[PDB]
Amino acid sequence: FVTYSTSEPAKLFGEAGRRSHFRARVLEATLSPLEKAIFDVPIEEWLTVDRSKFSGWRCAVPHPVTADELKPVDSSHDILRHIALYNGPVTDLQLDAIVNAANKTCLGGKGVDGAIHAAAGPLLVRECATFKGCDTGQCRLTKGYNLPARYVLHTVGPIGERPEELRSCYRSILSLAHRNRLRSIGFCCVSTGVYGYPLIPATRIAVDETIEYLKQHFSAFDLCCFACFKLEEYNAYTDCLRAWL
Amino acid sequence: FVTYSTSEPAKLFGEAGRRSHFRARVLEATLSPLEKAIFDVPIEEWLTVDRSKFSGWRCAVPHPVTADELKPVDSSHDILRHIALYNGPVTDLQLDAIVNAANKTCLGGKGVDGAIHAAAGPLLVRECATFKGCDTGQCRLTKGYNLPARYVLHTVGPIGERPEELRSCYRSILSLAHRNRLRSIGFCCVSTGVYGYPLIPATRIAVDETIEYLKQHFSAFDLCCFACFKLEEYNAYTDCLRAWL
């Protein structure tokens, strides 16, 4: 078997040119009047506008899930009344923001990242192309475009099992949402999955940081929802929350 | 609104470290005995083995589509009896190979690339990590693992509308499949979609190269199938094939 269509290169060198070239093509593309109208809404204004007034805006989710439909893990508990689990994709959630597990370029990728870009539509990556990427453990904020949610919080988790970098992601998301007075957030499972942060330790950290933030800042959030696409993820949160209790 | 969780960096610099680090974590991971058994099958041997004999192998597609279920565009025509269209994901196809629209690193990404890695399972990226990426217009061959198809042909199409680079992809895929005596190939729509190669010109090229290969090499293939996830794509092939006739 031959396994490549030409001679092998001198060594591995390709990658960063593709991404800069993609970023360049995204920035250079001509937006329609429909798209431009949506794209120019100032970011802070997007929270509250009526998005149906733009013919370019087509909600990507047929039946979005609103905050009133998300039951907390314990309505009696002073902290855990602000926490809910959703057994489905984070893109269903019509909240102030959802979290995207991004990479340093913020230009899309596999997994939840690709799902979010696909639901939000082409303007999401256009907004991401305009800023200088995202560092590991930090968070960027954009509009959510065709998402039911208003904003996306793009964070960059660690590749491996680096507890202090993943902690930082949760800290950055929570502080940035709070700074902008966003009151409901839908999380995805940052850094988990194939070759990533093992599920239970990751979930431990997510739960621990989010509860610590809620304890220390009474007035910050109405709801933090952990969207758990897979049943395994849902059960990890359930166990960690029960183990936290 | 604050849109980033810390100070802006001096300039955009991050990206290539993440990918090399991901590649490193993939290569360093310990395979199970089940996985190792599958992974060590020599590539040329994989075509013909009985994959059900490995407990690690779980076909990712419940009801795969075999070549006998793929009707050609014209059974009377000497060339077009070897061409079929499928209105569904390329991952359904149980053929000798399917084509992945990859990036230069071959480590996964958005779109069909992510779909293929997800269906094939974690060993696909492990095999990709072992080689020196893929150049634009060239093609790499790997085993397909949990895919119904035996192999994956990872090509790197151009980002923009570069006809000679996309031609090269089709030429590389076709010549590499033929060199290895693979006789049935499932294509995806290389380089198309948001910010990419416009659909009709891309499809023109795919059709033109594939038919030219079939004309010149009578004995190469039994079937080339264009998997068209979206109806728009299906109609583009139908029009190009009809326009070729």
Residue numbers in the entry:
A (entry chain A), B (entry chain A): 13 to 257
Structure paper excerpt:
The macrodomain fold (starting from residues 99 and 92 in TbMDO and TcMDO, respectively) is well-conserved between the human MacroD proteins and consists of a central mostly parallel six-stranded β-sheet surrounded by five α-helices. Active site of the macrodomains is located at the C-terminal edge of the β-sheet and is lined by N-terminal ends of four α-helices.
Crystal structures of TbMDO were determined to 1.95 Å and 1.2 Å resolution (for crystal form 1 and 2, respectively) and crystal structure of TcMDO to 2.0 Å resolution. Structures of TbMDO and TcMDO comprise residues from 11–261 and 13–257, respectively and share a highly conserved structure (RMSD 0.84 Å). The N-terminus of TbMDO and TcMDO also pack differently in the crystal. While the N-terminus of the TbMDO folds back to the core and extends the β-sheet, the N-terminus of the TcMDO packs to the precisely same site but in the neighboring molecule in the crystal. No complex of ADP-ribose with TcMDO could be acquired but comparing the TbMDO-ADP-ribose complex with TcMDO revealed that a loop aligning the distal ribose binding pocket adopts an open conformation, indicating that the ADP-ribose binding pocket at this region is not preformed in TcMDO. The observed open conformation is unlikely a crystal packing artefact, as there are no major constrictions caused by packing at this region of the crystal lattice. In addition, an identical conformation for the loop is observed in the apo-structure of human MacroD1. The larger enthalpy drop in TcMDO could be due to the open conformation of the active site.
